[PDB]
Amino acid sequence: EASNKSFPRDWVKTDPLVPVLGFAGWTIPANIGVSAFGGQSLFGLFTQSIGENLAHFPTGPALDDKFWLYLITYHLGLFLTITLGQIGVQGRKQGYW
Amino acid sequence: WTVPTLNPDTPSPIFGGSTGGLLRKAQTEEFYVITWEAKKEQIFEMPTGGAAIMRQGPNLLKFGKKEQCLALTTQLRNKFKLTPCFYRVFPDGKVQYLHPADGVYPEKVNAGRVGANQNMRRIGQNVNPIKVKFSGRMMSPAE
Amino acid sequence: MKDFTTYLSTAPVIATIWFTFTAGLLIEINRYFPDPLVFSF
Amino acid sequence: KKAQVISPVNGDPFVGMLETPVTSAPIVATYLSNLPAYRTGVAPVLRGVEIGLAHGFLLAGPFIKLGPLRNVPETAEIAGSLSAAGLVLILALCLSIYGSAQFQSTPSIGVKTLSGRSVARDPLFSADGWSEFAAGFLVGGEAGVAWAYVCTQILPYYS
Amino acid sequence: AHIVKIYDTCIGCTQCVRACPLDVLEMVPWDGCKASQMASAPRTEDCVGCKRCETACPTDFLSVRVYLGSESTRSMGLSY
Amino acid sequence: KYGENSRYFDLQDMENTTGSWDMYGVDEKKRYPDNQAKFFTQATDIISRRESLRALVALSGIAAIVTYGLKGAKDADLPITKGPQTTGENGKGGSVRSRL
Amino acid sequence: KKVKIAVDRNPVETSFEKWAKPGHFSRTLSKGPNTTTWIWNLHADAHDFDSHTSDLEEISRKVFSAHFGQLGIIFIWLSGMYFHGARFSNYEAWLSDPTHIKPSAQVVWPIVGQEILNGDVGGGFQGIQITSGFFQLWRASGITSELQLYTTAIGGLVMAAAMFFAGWFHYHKAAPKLEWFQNVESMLNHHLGGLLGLGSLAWAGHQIHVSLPVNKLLDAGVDPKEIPLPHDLLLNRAIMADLYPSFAKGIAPFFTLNWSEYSDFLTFKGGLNPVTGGLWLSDTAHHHVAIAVLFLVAGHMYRTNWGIGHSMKEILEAHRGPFTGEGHVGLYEILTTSWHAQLAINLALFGSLSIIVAHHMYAMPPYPYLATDYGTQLSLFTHHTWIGGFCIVGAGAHAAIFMVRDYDPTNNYNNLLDRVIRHRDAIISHLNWVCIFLGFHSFGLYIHNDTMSALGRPQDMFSDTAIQLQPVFAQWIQNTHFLAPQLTAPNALAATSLTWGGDLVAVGGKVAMMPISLGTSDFMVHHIHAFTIHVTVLILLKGVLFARSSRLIPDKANLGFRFPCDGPGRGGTCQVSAWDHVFLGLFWMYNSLSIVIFHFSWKMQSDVWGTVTASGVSHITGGNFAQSANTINGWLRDFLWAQSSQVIQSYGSALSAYGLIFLGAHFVWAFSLMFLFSGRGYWQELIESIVWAHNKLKVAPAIQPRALSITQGRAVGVAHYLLGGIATTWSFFLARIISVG
Ligand code: CLA
Ligand code: CLA
Ligand code: CLA
Ligand code: CLA
Ligand code: CLA
Ligand SMILES: CC1=C(/C=C/C(C)=C/C=C/C(C)=C/C=C/C=C(C)/C=C/C=C(C)/C=C/C2=C(C)CCCC2(C)C)C(C)(C)CCC1
Ligand SMILES: CC1=C(C/C=C(\C)CCC[C@H](C)CCC[C@H](C)CCCC(C)C)C(=O)c2ccccc2C1=O
Ligand code: SF4
């Protein structure tokens, strides 16, 4: 490493467009209703469960709630979309292809 | 030949950093500096783990152990046929030339180094421990 | 086949053959003279 | 393919620490610099008081909720606070004897700040500084254990 | 430190000095009443005690002997 | 100097050379309210020496263990202080010989 | 073209002259023995082909032909199993009544009273009750006869002869050049598309045409002699159409993409066959078709001789980030130039695969009447788990061998390997910390519970009653897979396993598989597993990363991969070698997998396996894993001491060999401790005092008796340790589960 003498402070080359665009690229397809959810959506059912579990705020969700499935799947896709958007943006600006 | 003084303005090989380098020992008691002149930019192995590029010309390297410096010395002499010399550096700023103490390497003779710790008897001619018993410190019959 | 019979004379091959022989001899002795606890014959 | 993140420590590739996001992210560096351990100009007794308050308050919880009298309604909190007081006392003892053992050799090399300017050694790292630091730790830790009990008694939503 | 003695059966093969990873030994001329060279141990304060020297000695018995003595930072091979 | 052209060894800068850095220390004098700092510099005034602190620790710990054995263990309602509350395993020595 | 067949013609003369010269492959062994260390080194260096020569071509040729030898030996072994099933078996009797007859395929000769091992297994047969699962595998393949097993044995012997001929041919007659081995793109294309794609497709075809009909008739109560032979099902489409009507339509629905017509024999039922307790072979056939297509498309990924495809070098050299420097640059050369790197990766994944196989074959029993043969199930799990652990330790070993021998810092500058070696201290420090944290918060939980139970405080234990450490993540995953056919796998009729939840499948009154409930004991033992795994990883990864150099010894690569020490200096450098890190990782892999298989055995015998006498399941041990596996004394009492009553009381039975091997494995294990606890310097002096007595009577051998090398002492010790422990567990498990199950 002939470069990197002082650990640049901008180690994450931040683009504020990246989180917004990953969020919109995931949640908008996640707002498409499909046959498997009974016509509903993943984000729709996730927010529905968020509401149903905020109706008793202290009491957390159960093991049999289905809020955890929506949570984990939604955030799998969302984190993947956000990190791949950051990677793609900073590879486009930089080299990498 | 006379003792060479360590030039601190010597550059260092291209190394991206490791975790096997110096520790608080360098700040407290002593560390070691090894210098050599390279004919071309070559990739060598660091004794700390990792690959570094020695620069064309003089190269300086810091280590926290003499065995590290002599491992790199034997690597540079056997894989690159260089002639490195290393020093002992203290946090005081005192530098002690170490490796070719005579200028030549110790596997060859220089006619002027004095022999030390040479028992002029056979190894089976040592006395029994009952003869060196109660010598103050606990001792071996080889003394 | 001088070299093959030199191979068969090697320590592991000769050991295998000799111990197959000894074990087979003991096994046949114990088949035809079963349960020999004492020398009585 | 530019912009590598992990760098050698202060640009020295032979010291061996490898500055890294977890090490030298400005948020992380800021938070760790603002901790009383790294406030090298502040008196060690007061940094010890803060550290001790924090630790005495935090290490009462385990003794309260997981101790041997955790299932007795009013006795769980008392027993846990007293266990934490004892542990804080033991820790103050250990701190004292560490100050007795460690600070006898007086290191001679100076310090810098990853920027080039040499700073004075932390007075904490002396016999007197560590003794007053341990005094502060004891005071603050017993105070924080007492405050942990007080919070068991006065916080609305304490279970 | 460790005690590294060298006895008068040394044949000047230099292999002990070649094999020492600490530069403890060297080859000196005509101290042994022998052929040209004899081995020496002038830097036993750097000896870690590996016994690579007496692993490389061809004489029987060894003409170089390492007696592990009191330990230090250098003898224990510490980078810390 | 020490950062000029990969010159990581300086005899006049042995702090940067040996890596003697304060990676997170700040020497700012201002952290605490001065009345609070006064309160806590005076609260620890008596125990700010090793001997005084160890005297406090000895007194407190010995008093604590003694009052715990005398009073605190019974206040905690420990089973070793209540006693068996039963005839115990007295007459059941062994499965064969039921010894006292 | 670049990808081509390239061979040397007659490189090596086929001759016996080097058989007669032991140690020909080495320059240090060709000089003949003077000491017995030569006799040991001749065997330690026999297959270290990279220490015989240094050019990669001859190494690769030796490796190829030795692989052919291994395949020929495996074929001999398989033909032997099939032959013993054809000649020394009760298989035809077992087909007619698999729920009562114990599978046996080994008969013992009546010589020294050992005909007692020929036990009453059933079917008018006397032999050794086997635990290999070969009967269930043969019934799944649709064998139904000893003649088919005999001809499979003959085919296996023919294929073994073929493999040995191929080794001789590809070493001595037409040996491939180095550029032929380095065609990794074509090798992967063929091994994915052909070895795994065409292989899975061919097995799918066998299942479509042989296994499915034969087993559908076997499950319909048809006696195996009334069942049509496989060729009658191949020739007569009317019989297959009578069993599966989609066969009336032919292969037209396949080419017209009317694949749903094949839903008769290509199903997604999931769960288990209620008649056999095994997987639906229609699901299995569909599975093999699917993965055949998948691997056949996967084997068209890499570029060989036409422009299409990928260059793996490009993929690697393109995958780099801001954290990893140059990235995967220089790894293609590593993995095309070093055999030990490939062996490391391949052994790692093969052992992980064997363990995955173990975990997936018990939960989804793929063979009929396998789930209720509790001995077969337990033995298969244990076996494949052990094979996997051994392969993983070997992966560590050969990664270290690569690092010592084939690693070059010139080809690795600021790439992932250089950057891993450059922060190895952080890796190993955090691994050490997590190992200590896991050891504490896993085993100290058991110690806390033992102390509380001994102190009379069960309310203070980490139990399902007092202080519940519930594995809620695993429980959630269980519930999620159980409810998959409802939401997330709607075309599946049932869940993959009954272990997720639901009802039990009972076959012959015995439980094939039933829901496994996870509780505090399961939490604790899974964290024990994680702990032991992390420590094994610690040892092996420390041997890999510190194979070349350390802060203790900076020139460790020159000492080699396999050296005892550097000396008693630096305080002592014993076992700094990477070989010794493998030597210790073996002990820790043993300690890990012993607990793995103990957890499996107890969990199965307590919460899954058992009988359905009335309406209600009576488990083997009685469901005591939940309340007794919280303590070490519970594992000692309720598992080791209790379940040993079948292996120590087996004298006078057909299981007496298991008690004998129990005791003998104990003996071998303890005998390992003479080599592990001791050192060479005592034994050389004892040997020379014995050599005195041999010299006195003029029987001193010319091959001088030496003590085993330090490395060999350690190797013998760990080998005997592993053998003793594993065979002790083997005898204990089998004697227990043949009796109680
Ligand atoms: C050192 C301990 C020891 C001792 C003393 C014995 C002793 C015995 N065992 Mg035990 N055994 C041992 C260890 C031991 N065993 C171990 C470790 C195992 C487990 C592997 C066993 C397992 C075992 C079994 C399973 C059986 C025995 C049996 C026997 C008996 C063998 C009788 C026999 O074969 O007649 C052989 C008689 C001879 C005369 C043979 C002597 C050898 C030659 C032939 C004599 C030379 C003749 C001539 C000069 C040759 C000319 C040249 C030739 C080439 C033609 C005997 C009482 C058997 C028995 O019935 O016990 C009651 C039996 O069934 N043992
Ligand atoms: C009769 C046929 C024949 C002959 C004369 C030779 C002759 C030779 N071969 Mg070739 N070879 C053959 C067949 C033959 N080979 C076959 C069939 C294969 C495929 C496996 C090979 C593969 C091969 C390789 C890869 C190599 C040779 C080498 C050699 C040379 C010396 C080998 C040696 O020391 O043998 C003596 C060795 C043995 C007898 C060991 C045989 C081990 C067998 C294959 C496995 C048995 C395992 C056994 C079941 C384990 C039981 C364990 C026990 C506890 C029960 C020599 C030129 C070597 C060389 O350097 O050539 C220049 C070399 O590297 N050969
Ligand atoms: C479709 C083509 C194909 C197939 C099926 C295989 C199959 C195999 N290869 Mg691979 N290989 C291929 C193409 C193929 N290879 C190409 C193109 C190359 C050059 C880059 C290589 C280079 C290569 C090496 C370097 C090695 C292998 C090895 C193996 C064996 C691994 C062990 C195993 O899975 O046991 C499964 C066992 C079976 C499925 C039994 C059936 C075996 C059949 C008879 C052989 C496969 C057909 C053969 C490749 C084509 C020639 C036929 C012959 C009659 C001329 C396996 C048999 C390894 C091995 O063990 O070598 C022996 C090994 O070291 N192969
Ligand atoms: C490798 C796997 C495999 C194999 C070998 C077969 C083989 C077969 N299947 Mg099966 N099948 C498979 C996978 C497989 N299938 C899978 C995955 C599915 C699910 C989609 C099916 C679904 C399926 C159905 C639904 C049906 C079959 C049928 C058939 C048969 C008709 C073949 C046919 O019409 O194709 C045509 C194949 C060829 C034309 C190739 C023949 C080429 C010959 C061998 C050339 C040799 C000539 C030589 C050079 C000269 C003579 C030599 C000498 C005498 C001189 C045949 C036995 C049908 C049947 O009747 O089953 C009983 C049927 O109804 N299969
Ligand atoms: C695909 C599998 C595979 C392959 C091809 C290799 C290949 C190799 N290994 Mg690796 N290895 C593997 C798996 C593998 N190993 C596994 C699983 C382990 C962990 C146990 C190791 C651990 C290992 C170490 C630690 C070392 C090697 C070494 C070697 C090399 C030489 C080995 C030799 O000459 O032994 C020849 C064969 C023997 C000496 C026989 C050993 C017999 C064992 C110890 C007894 C077990 C037999 C049986 C199961 C027990 C019952 C027997 C009964 C009679 C009582 C060679 C490159 C060595 C090397 O490269 O040196 C530089 C080396 O030091 N390997
Ligand atoms: C068990 C065993 C055995 C036996 C085995 C066997 C018997 C096997 C077989 C195998 C086989 C028997 C195979 C086959 C295969 C086949 C295939 C693989 C086919 C394929 C096809 C395809 C791929 C197609 C394609 C196409 C189409 C689809 C259409 C048209 C066009 C084309 C042609 C392109 C032995 C004896 C060895 C011993 C050991 C064990
Ligand atoms: C017991 C032991 C020995 C002594 C073991 C000896 C040397 C090996 C014995 C192997 C066999 C018994 C010798 C082989 C002799 C012939 C090949 C056998 C053929 C004839 C038989 C029928 C007798 C060591 O050398 C050793 C070295 C380092 C650490 C631990 C130990 C250790 O524990
Ligand atoms: S001490 Fe031994 S190795 Fe060294 S020079 Fe003398 S004889 Fe050679």
Greatest alpha-carbon pair distance for chain G in Å reads: 91
The pair of structure tokens assigned to F52 is: 């005084």
- Nearest 10 degrees: CA dihedral of G447, G452, G454, G458? -130
Residues G524, G528, G529, G530, CA torsion sign:
positive
Residue B69 CA to residue D91 CA, distance in Å, equals 42
Q: How far is CA G732 from CA A12, G295, G588, G646, in A?
A: 57, 41, 21, 8
CA atoms within 13 A on the CB side of F42: 6
> Is any Cβ of chain B less than 8 angstroms from the Cβ of E75?
no
Is the shortest distance between the CB of G248 and ligand 4 below 6 Å? Answer: no
Q: Do the chains contact at F10 and B91, CB–CB below 8 Å?
A: no
Q: What angle do CA D16, A14, A22 make, to 5 degrees?
A: 120
Distance CA D130, CA B113 (A): 51
Instruction: Give the separation between CA B116 and CA E31, rounded to whole angstroms.
Output: 10
Map G204-222 to HEC letters.
Answer: HHHHHHHHHHHHHHHCCCC
Between B and G, how many residue pairs show a Cβ–Cβ distance under 8 A?
62
Which residue, judged by its Cα, is nearest atom 20 of ligand 4?
G254
Which residue bears the tokens 């990477």?
G578
CATH of domain G2-741: 1.20.1130.10
**Ligand located closest to C19 CA:** 7
G67, G195, G198, G201, best to mutate for ligand 3 pocket (most atoms within 8 Å of CB): G195
Task: Please list, in sequence order, all residues whose beta carbon lies within 8 angstroms of the beta carbon of residue G559, skipping any fewer than 6 positions away.
Answer: G553, G566, G577
Helices (H), A14-66: 17-27, 42-54
| Rounded Cα gap, residues E64 and F1, in angstroms | 46
* Residue type at position F11: L
Of the candidates B34, B44, B81, the residue with the CA atom closest to the CA atom of residue G548: B44
Task: State both tokens at G635.
Answer: 């594992």
Atom of ligand 5 nearest to the CA of G711: 64
Helices of type H across G490-553: 520-545
- Amino acid symbol at G74: I
Residue B100 is part of which domain span?
1-143
Measure in Å the smallest separation between the Cα of A92 and chain D Cα atoms.
Answer: 10
3 state SS of G611: strand
**What are residue B44's phi and psi, to 5 degrees?**
-125, 170
The two structure tokens encoding residue D74: 């009013």
Closest by Cα among G542, G520, G504 to G629: G520
Q: Identify whether the C-beta of residue G527 lies closer than 8 Å to the C-beta of residue G558.
A: no
**Of G202, G316, G131, the residue nearest G741 (C-alpha):** G131
Please give the helix or strand (H or E) that residue A71 lies within, else none. helix A67-93
G20 contacts on C by Cβ (under 8 Å): 2-4, 6-7, 10
For the record, the structure tokens of G483 come out as 């409810």
Q: What angle do CA G546, G547, G548 make, to 5 degrees?
A: 95
Based on its alpha-carbon atoms, the radius of gyration of chain E, rounded to whole angstroms, reads: 12
Q: Count Cβ atoms below 10 Å from residue B42 Cβ, excluding itself.
A: 18
DSSP B67-122: HHHHHHHHHHHHHS----EEEEE-TTS-EEE-TTTTSS-TTS--S-PPP-SB-SS-
What is the H or E stretch that residue G511 is in?
Answer: strand G510-513
* Spacing, Cα G317 to ligand 1 middle (Å): 69
For CA atoms G211, G214, G215, G216, the dihedral sign is positive
Q: Which of G668, G139, G116 is nearest to G369 (CA)?
A: G139
CA C41 to chain centre: 24
Please give the tally of structural domains in chain B.
1
Q: Spell out the residues 6+ positions from residue G264 whose beta carbon is closer than 8 angstroms to its own.
A: G244, G245, G246, G282
The radius of gyration computed from the CA coordinates of chain F, to the nearest angstrom, equals 31
Here the tokens at position C22 are 């000894």
**E19 C-beta closer than 6 A to ligand 8:** no
A94 closest CB neighbour out of D1, D24, D25: D1
Phi first, then psi: what are they for G115, rounded to 5°?
-75, 0
The DSSP annotation for G520-538 comes to HHHHHHHHHHHHHHHHHHH
Q: Is B63 helix (H, G, I), strand (E, B) or coil?
A: strand
Reduced to 3 states (helix: H, G, I; strand: E, B; else coil), residue D111 is strand
Name chain G contacts of D18, Cβ cutoff 8 Å.
Answer: 422-423, 426
Using CA atoms, how far apart are residues G228 and B103, in angstroms rounded to an integer?
93
DSSP H helices in G423-515: 424-439, 445-455, 472-482
Helix, strand, coil share of chain C (percent; to 5): 70, 0, 30
Distance (angstroms) between ligand 3 centre and the Cα of G84 equals 28
Residues of B in contact with F19 (CB under 8 A): 21-22, 26-27
Q: Is B64 on the interface with E (CB under 8 A)?
A: yes
Ordered DSSP codes for G17-29: TTTTSTTTT-TTT
Tell me the helix, strand and coil percentages in chain E, rounded to 5: 10, 20, 70
Q: What whole-number distance in Å separates Cα of residue G75 and Cα of residue G159?
A: 7
- Contacts of residue D158, Cβ cutoff 8 Å, sequence gap at least 6: D151, D152
Please state whether G34 falls in left (phi above 0), alpha (psi between -120 and 50) or beta: alpha
Distant-in-sequence, close-in-space partners of G255: CB < 8 Å, separation ≥ 6: none
Structure tokens at G106: 């080994």
Residue D10's CB: how many other CB atoms inside 10 A?
24
Angle between the N-to-C axes of helices G56-87 and G339-363, in degrees from 0 to 180, rounded to the nearest 10: 30
CB G664 within 8 A of CB G656: no
Q: CB neighbours of B47 closer than 8 A, spacing ≥ 6?
A: B20, B63, B67, B68, B71, B72, B75, G549, G554, G555
Gap from CA of G203 to ligand 6 centroid (Å): 8
Query: Going along D74-144, which residue ranges are E strands?
Result: none
Is B32 in a helix, a strand, or coil?
Answer: strand
Experimental approach: cryo-EM
Upper half-sphere CA count for residue D39 (Cβ side, 13 Å): 19
Q: Residue G241 contacts by C-beta under 8 Å, 6 or more apart in sequence?
A: G247, G248
The Cα angle at residue G174 between residues G172 and G175, in degrees rounded to 5: 75
Rounded Cα distance between G515 and G363, Å, is 10
Report the C-alpha gap between A78 and B48 in whole angstroms.
Answer: 41
Rounded to 5 degrees, φ, ψ at B96 are -120, 110
Residues G680 and G713: beta-carbon distance below 8 Å: yes
Cβ within 8 Å of residue G24, ≥6 positions away:
G18, G30
Residue count of chain C:
41
Query: Residue G166 half-sphere exposure, CB side, CA atoms within 13 Å?
Result: 16
Question: Whole-angstrom Cα distance, residue B84 to residue G646?
Answer: 71
In chain F, residues preceding a discontinuity (C to N beyond 2.5 A) are none
Burial B106-121 (b: 16+ CB within 10 A, else e): beebbeebebbbbbee
Q: What is the token pair recorded at G2?
A: 């670049």
Residue with tokens 């109660």: B134
Displacement of CA G207 from its chain's centroid (Å): 25
Three-point CA angle B10, D7, B23, nearest 5°: 65
Contacts of G308 (CB under 8 A, 6+ apart): none
Question: Token pair of G552, please?
Answer: 């203790």
**Residue to test with chain B: of G414, G542, G555, G556, most B Cβ within 10 A:** G555
Distance, in Å, from the CA atom of D61 to the CA atom of D34, rounded to the nearest integer, reads: 25
CATH number at residue C35: 1.20.5.510
Domain limits, chain E: 1-80
Work out the minimum CA distance from A61 to partner chain D, whole angstroms.
Answer: 19
Rounded Cα distance between G385 and G344, Å, is 18
Q: How far apart are CA G152 and CA A26, in angstroms?
A: 55
Rounded to the nearest angstrom, the distance between the alpha carbon of G204 and the centre of ligand 6 is 9
HSE-up of G70 (CA within 13 Å, CB side)? 7
CB contact (8 A) between residue C6 and residue G19: yes
Give the closest residue to B32 by CA, choosing from F9, G718, F2: F9
Mode of pairing for the β-strands spanning G104-106 and G126-129 = antiparallel
D143 is written with which tokens? 């105070």
Query: What is the stated resolution of the deposited model, in angstroms?
Result: 2.8
Helix-strand-coil split of chain F, %, nearest 5: 45, 0, 55
Number of domains in chain C: 1
Q: How many residues does chain A have?
A: 97
The verdict on the CB of residue G184 being under 6 Å from ligand 3 is no
Whether D142 contacts D85, CB under 8 Å: yes
Spatial separation of the C-alpha atoms in residues G511 and D96, rounded to whole Å: 64
Residue F77 is encoded by which pair of tokens? 């309602």
Helix ranges (H only) for G423-464 are 424-439, 445-455
Rounded Cα gap, residues B9 and B16, in angstroms: 20
Short-list G369, G378, G275, G362, CA closest to G738: G378
Task: Give the annotated binding-site residues of E for [4Fe-4S] cluster.
Answer: 10, 13, 16, 20, 47, 50, 53, 57
Distance (Å, whole) CA A14 – CA A20: 12
Tokens 């064309």, residue? B56
Q: Residue G398 CA: which ligand is closest? A: 5
**How many other β-carbons are positioned within 10 Å of the β-carbon of residue G596?**
25
Structure token digits, residue G705: 């008796």
- Which token pair is G308? 């299409």
Contact B12 F8 (CB under 8 A): yes
Is F73 in contact with D69 (CB distance < 8 Å)? no
Contacts of G467 (CB under 8 A, 6+ apart): D66, G460, G461, G520
Task: Return the number of other C-beta atoms located less than 10 Å from residue G637's C-beta.
Answer: 13
Q: List the end-to-end C-alpha distance of chain B, in Å, as a whole number.
A: 34
Cis peptide preceding G169, ω within 30 of 0:
no
Burial G642-658 (b: 16+ CB within 10 A, else e): bbeebbeebeebbbbbb
Give whole-number Cα distances, A36 to A25, A39, A46, C2, G484, in Å: 21, 7, 14, 78, 12
The atom of ligand 6 lying closest to the CA of G151 is: 36
- Residue G112 Cα distances to C33, C36, G26, G635, G671, angstroms: 10, 10, 45, 38, 27
Kindly tell me the burial class for residue G507, based on how many C-beta atoms sit within 10 Å of its own C-beta (0-12, 13-18, 19 or more). Answer: buried
Tell me which residue has its CA closest to atom 57 in ligand 3: G195
Other CB atoms within 10 Å distance of the CB of residue G28: 10
